[PDB]
């Protein structure tokens, strides 16, 4: 269930390409792409929290994301995954998305904001699932053979693998400080602010209310929010606030790997004729098919080749 | 298949961070200096040295 996320929050992280060809900090930044399954299913870990509202209630139609210094809600219907072409999402929970994507060299994820602003993040990723069986097919057939494969399942609990969540680092914000006639405002807005600077006024410390320094210039001083109530995943893109992270909690990872059976096609029968100690066959593949043969004796002389078109083969 | 794990980096704005070794299957640790990291709201670290 989603009870484990009651004390957690969405977070922002750096994204190498925000869709404009330029990098920025983004609410939809990806953390990792996992492709352990052999059936081609992808498991994507993102900073977004899906199925959880900002009020910590459970709603499968909503996602929550980080917006500046506050959590915010958005429709789950606006969530998308894409590679070389639009990708189909098979299910979601928390930070994890299951989807079946078409082959491509890149992968991106995004959603529509509360202001109807699109957000996306793109990462390089080679997606090209392994071949199951001896034939290369693009879709499952009406009739065929069944072979073993690995997939992800919809189980959402007791997966035994967990992610650590820790109290976040100080969050800098240049918007907190402004310059009003020779003085600096601070403007806390409900969140405790730490401030300090190399100023002759030597005015530094914590505040819970607007504090006017009264001597220094806004371009001289730094400030950040330090008081946080909810913890976040200790992502590699977020600085540690201590040698060892504090307020440690744990979130289990949904969608474990499982043993399932995949359907594969069977190539149509060849046309066969015979000569003297010779077999001649015409192959009629629709898709690349492996042909191989061996002698049933001491020296098998094994040979194999791929055929992508009608071919005459003499053995 | 092996998995690579990278815990959040630790930043010490005004001093040198120290390193402890570990007995994990394949472990490395290094300290870098002269870093001046930024966040979405502006520079993270106050000290420029």
């Amino acid at each position, epitope marked *: 269930n989603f009870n484990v996320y009651k004390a957690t929050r969405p977070y922002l992280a750096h994204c190498p390409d925000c869709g404009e060809g330029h990098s920025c900090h983004s609410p939809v930044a990806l953390e990792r792409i996992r492709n352990e399954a052999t059936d081609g299913t992808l498991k994507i870990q993102v900073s977004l929290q899906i199925g959880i509202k900002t009020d910590d209630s459970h709603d499968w139609t909503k996602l929550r994301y980080m917006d500046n210094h506050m959590p915010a809600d958005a429709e789950r219907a606006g969530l998308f995954v894409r590679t070389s072409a639009p990708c189909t999402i098979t299910g979601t929970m928390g930070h994890f998305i299951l989807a079946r994507c078409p082959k491509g060299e890149t992968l991106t994820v995004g959603f529509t904001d509360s202001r109807k602003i699109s957000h996306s993040c793109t990462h390089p990723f080679h997606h090209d699932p392994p071949v199951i069986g001896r034939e290369k097919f693009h879709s499952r057939p009406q009739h065929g053979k069944e072979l073993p494969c690995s997939t992800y399942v919809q189980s959402t609990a007791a997966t035994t693998e967990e992610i650590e969540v820790h109290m976040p680092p100080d969050t800098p914000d240049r918007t907190l400080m402004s310059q009003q006639s020779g003085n600096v405002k601070i403007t806390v807005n409900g969140q405790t602010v730490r401030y300090k600077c190399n100023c002759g006024g030597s005015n530094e410390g*914590l505040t819970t209310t607007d504090k006017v320094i009264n001597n220094c210039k806004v371009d001289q001083c730094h400030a950040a929010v330090t008081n946080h109530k909810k913890w976040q995943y200790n992502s590699p893109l977020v600085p540690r606030n201590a040698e060892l992270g504090d307020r440690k909690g744990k979130i289990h990872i949904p969608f474990p790997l499982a043993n399932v059976t995949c359907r594969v096609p069977k190539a149509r029968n060849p046309t066969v004729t015979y000569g003297k100690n010779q077999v001649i066959m015409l192959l009629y593949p629709d898709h690349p098919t492996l042909l191989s043969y061996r002698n049933m004796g001491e020296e098998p002389n094994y040979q194999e080749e791929w055929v992508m078109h009608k071919k005459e083969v003499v053995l | 298949e092996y998995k690579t794990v990278i815990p959040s980096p630790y930043v010490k704005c005004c001093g040198t961070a120290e390193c402890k070794d570990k007995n994990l299957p394949d472990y490395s640790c290094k300290v870098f200096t002269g870093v001046y990291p930024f966040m979405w709201g502006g520079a993270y670290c106050f000290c420029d040295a």
Partner: antibody, heavy 124, light 109 residues
Framework: EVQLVESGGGLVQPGRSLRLSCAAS????????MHWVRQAPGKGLEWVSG????????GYADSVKGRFTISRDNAKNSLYLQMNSLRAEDTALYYC?????????????????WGQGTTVTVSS | DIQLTQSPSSLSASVGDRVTITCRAS??????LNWYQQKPGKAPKLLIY???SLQSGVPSRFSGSGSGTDFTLTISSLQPEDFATYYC??????????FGQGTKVEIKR
């Protein structure tokens, strides 16, 4: 299950030395720095000495800087404090405490585990 | 040598009352201040560290706060079990940790 057990103490004459030690249990000794803290009757807590992991750094309070020596035995999971030339002013309860890291240079931490302090009395 | 300053003696409060204890340094020591709780006959226990993080096992009644250079410990509603002497501590980013004198809480009568 995590605890520190103090050993040693008792009555000693002025100018004489006394050895204190603590046994660690329930946690990995080599993952944390250790400190000694003492509390005289009617007084608050006073830090005495501390030792970093692998003895990378050694600190002492000014009042005992030239008189006390701190060491640790990782193989035995134990902490030691050697007090020389004890004075009447050194009478106090002596506690062992565990830090929250391997280094004492992290100011984000406090002392999370404390033992049961022993009594050291210095008098002729 | 930087000393810490706290309430001069003790506070008097009843059960359910709001209790505020403060600690400040004469000079800047660190960005964080820790709080400890001690009862007679017992070793001191860590209450808050990092000036914000509550130690595990500690009731939500206790919380960190502050203003300027003054660090604050707040008890939202004093309980019979919360009558203890509280101490402030700062490390100065070295082994030589510095402790305050402590503030005692007495029962109102």
């Amino acid at each position: 299950e995590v605890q520190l057990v103090e050993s040693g103490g008792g009555l000693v004459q002025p100018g004489r030395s006394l050895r204190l030690s603590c046994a660690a249990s329930g946690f990995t000794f080599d993952d944390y720095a250790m400190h000694w803290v003492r509390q005289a009757p009617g007084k608050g807590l006073e830090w005495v000495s501390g030792i970093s992991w692998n003895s990378g750094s050694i600190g002492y309070a000014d009042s005992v800087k030239g008189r006390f020596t701190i060491s640790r035995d990782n193989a035995k999971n134990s902490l030691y404090l050697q007090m020389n030339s004890l004075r009447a002013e050194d009478t106090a309860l002596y506690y062992c405490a565990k830090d929250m890291g391997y280094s004492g240079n992290d100011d984000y931490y406090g002392m999370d585990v404390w033992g049961q302090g022993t009594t050291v009395t210095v008098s002729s | 040598d930087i000393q810490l300053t706290q309430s001069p003696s003790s506070l008097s409060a009843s059960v359910g009352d709001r209790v505020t204890i403060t600690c400040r340094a004469s000079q800047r020591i660190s960005s964080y201040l820790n709080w400890y709780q001690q009862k007679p006959g017992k070793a001191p226990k860590l209450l808050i560290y990092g000036a914000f993080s509550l130690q595990s096992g500690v009731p939500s009644r206790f919380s960190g706060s502050g203003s300027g250079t003054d660090f604050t410990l707040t008890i939202s509603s004093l309980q019979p079990e919360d009558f203890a002497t509280y101490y402030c501590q700062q490390s100065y980013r070295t082994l030589t940790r510095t402790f305050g004198q402590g503030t005692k809480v007495e029962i109102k009568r």
